[PDB]
């Protein structure tokens, strides 16, 4: 029961925003202050 994100890229989710950012920034290049349009959060139980 948490929200994850995941990366609009590979469909990777991730439970904390971190692993996403730096996954965003590591593979997709996508610096911190652009991940809004490759990152995506929902909720799941
Ligand atoms: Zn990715």
């Known amino acids: 029961?948490?929200?994850v994100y995941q990366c609009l890229r590979?469909?990777?989710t991730f439970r904390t925003?971190?692993?996403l950012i730096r996954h965003?920034?590591?593979?997709?290049k996508?610096?911190?202050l652009s991940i809004?349009?490759?990152y995506?959060?929902?909720?799941?139980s």
């Open 10 to 12: 590979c469909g990777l």
């Open 30 to 32: 996508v610096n911190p």
């Open 24 to 28: 965003l920034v590591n593979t997709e």
């Open 40 to 44: 995506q959060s929902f909720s799941v």
């Open 17 to 19: 925003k971190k692993q």
């Open 36 to 38: 809004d349009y490759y």
């Open 1 to 3: 029961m948490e929200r």
